[PDB]
């Protein structure tokens with residue numbers, strides 16, 4: 001059942017690595033900064049019941065069910081195991097406002113929130129934009145609840161991530177459509193390869209085709225900062241670029257950054273090409289300095305992986321439509 005409404009959420013861009021917007025939970029609304037994440041399916045925010053021995057709970061906005069007159073208890077425990085870290089807590093229900101749309105939503109109140117990585121997060125929590133099939137606890141995701149109301153024009157949502165981390169718009173999510181202000185040319189669509197995941201077939205990864213030669217998978221993950229591949233995939237990619245492996249990233253001498261070759265991802269009969277300016281944090285041009293690349297190793301376990309993940313590095317260049325009605329992802333050139 002489709003309506004006549006389009007809505008948007010304005011996003012903040014923290015340092016090209018974290019894109020997040022505001023949601024309101026409870027009555028009166030308690031405001032949270034949240035990543036809208038196509039790589040997961042659950043909503044969660046940190047809880048007032050989080051021990052303050054978790055220093056991440058000292059430095060973030062905490063949802064207090066005891067301040068909301070529309071809260072409904074559930075209390076079922078949940079653990080969310082991401083590739084970057086784990087959160088745990090319990091289920092609650094309350095009214096959530098996102099882009100002036102109001103829904104009754106089941107979400108996680110997080111009581112265990114490790115310092116790494118969450119002391120490095122500008123955002124407080126996550127809004128899972130994935131499918132109910134990957135929701136821990138089988139909890140109906142927020143976009144499915146919004147769709148139930150019959151207000152949105154289309155069963156789609158779209159992401160714009162800007163390149164500029166103060167006057168500028170950091171990014172934008174359109175619920176119920178896409179914004180022509182932020183893309184140009186036509187959309188090119190790739191249909192989903194697997195039930196309940198924003199994942200597509202990829203036909204090759206080229207440097208200057210030396211990877212994914214007989215096919216592989218790409219998770220399109222709005223909640224991830226970087227492009228990732230498996231450890232073995234990224235090892236071969238990075239040897240070809242001449243980059244040095246550190247603990248949590250790969251780097252190149254800053255003077256070498258501009259000389260680095262294009263990296264192309266073959267998706268649905270189009271080649272999607274990033275130049276070095278799209279994947280190098282070009283912080284200086286000195287030979288004495290090291291500059292980090294926005295491509296990291298991430299071994300994602302079954303059944304989602306092994307897989308590449310196309311995060312904000314990719315989405316900055318390519319405006320992305322997530323089409324629930326037709327089970328496809330559309331890309332167009334961002335502006």
Ligand SMILES: CCN(C(=O)c1cnc(C)nc1NCc1ccco1)[C@H]1CCCNC1
Nearest residue numbers: 017018019035039082084117222223224225
């Ligand atoms: C939100 C948890 N995620 C992060 O990768 C992540 C971890 N830690 C920090 C500090 N930031 C993260 N995301 C920054 C960001 C926001 C939007 C674009 O990138 C992932 C978990 C797996 C599903 N996909 C999302």
